[PDB]
Amino acid sequence: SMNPPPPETSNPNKPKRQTNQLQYLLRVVLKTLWKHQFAWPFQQPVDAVKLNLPDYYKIIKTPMDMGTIKKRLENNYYWNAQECIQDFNTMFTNCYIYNKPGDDIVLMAEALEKLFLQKINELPT
Ligand SMILES: C=CCOC(=O)C1=C(C)Nc2c(c(=O)[nH]c(=O)n2CC)[C@@H]1c1ccc(C)cc1
């Protein structure tokens, strides 16, 4: 039930950029979602072995988590805010794909996604 290597957080040949919005995604959006009581399942890549979820990476082919996103933001890995917002949406979507409506893990992702959309509704200029 092995785990794949985690998503890259650096890529020297990918062009970096630092923008007002990406600074905000780290300092405001990520760091406060991180403190939510429901953040803990999403703070690191899914451990299919530890969690006896041996099928997780048979179903999820584009894994993403907030730990990866935080490191990407800290590394200026992203070209723009939309790229990072895409990663957040991948990790929410993955949760909805793998699990079922009403599952408690889905209720946690739904709560975080709602807060996420609340905070990105208005970004700096
Ligand atoms: C089965 C034993 C418990 O294992 C866990 O704690 C889990 C972790 C770390 N992550 C995931 C789990 C899951 O069921 N579906 C997923 O997509 N993820 C990845 C985000 C399970 C889980 C988490 C939280 C609740 C409330 C229930 C189940």
UniProtKB/Swiss-Prot annotation:
Chromatin reader protein that recognizes and binds acetylated histones and plays a key role in transmission of epigenetic memory across cell divisions and transcription regulation. Remains associated with acetylated chromatin throughout the entire cell cycle and provides epigenetic memory for postmitotic G1 gene transcription by preserving acetylated chromatin status and maintaining high-order chromatin structure. During interphase, plays a key role in regulating the transcription of signal-inducible genes by associating with the P-TEFb complex and recruiting it to promoters. The NET domain mediates interaction with a number of chromatin proteins involved in transcription regulation (NSD3, JMJD6, CHD4, GLTSCR1 and ATAD5). This is Bromodomain-containing protein 4. Ubiquitously expressed. There is a cross-link at residue 58 (Glycyl lysine isopeptide (Lys-Gly) (interchain with G-Cter in SUMO2)). Phosphorylation by CK2 disrupt the intramolecular binding between the bromo domain 2 and the NPS region and promotes binding between the NPS and the BID regions, leading to activate the protein and promote binding to acetylated histones. In absence of phosphorylation, BRD4 does not localize to p53/TP53 target gene promoters, phosphorylation promoting recruitment to p53/TP53 target promoters. JQ1, a thieno-triazolo-1,4-diazepine derivative, and I-BET, a benzodiazepine derivative, have been tested on tumors with success. Treatment with GSK1210151A (I-BET151, a I-BET derivative) has strong effets on mixed lineage leukemia and promotes myeloid differentiation and leukemia stem-cell depletion. It comes from the Eukaryota. The lineage of its organism: Eukaryota, Metazoa, Chordata, Craniata, Vertebrata. It is found in: Nucleus; Chromosome. It is linked to Cornelia de Lange syndrome 6: A form of Cornelia de Lange syndrome, a clinically heterogeneous developmental disorder associated with malformations affecting multiple systems. It is characterized by facial dysmorphisms, abnormal hands and feet, growth delay, cognitive retardation, hirsutism, gastroesophageal dysfunction and cardiac, ophthalmologic and genitourinary anomalies. CDLS6 inheritance is autosomal dominant. It comes from Homo sapiens (Human).
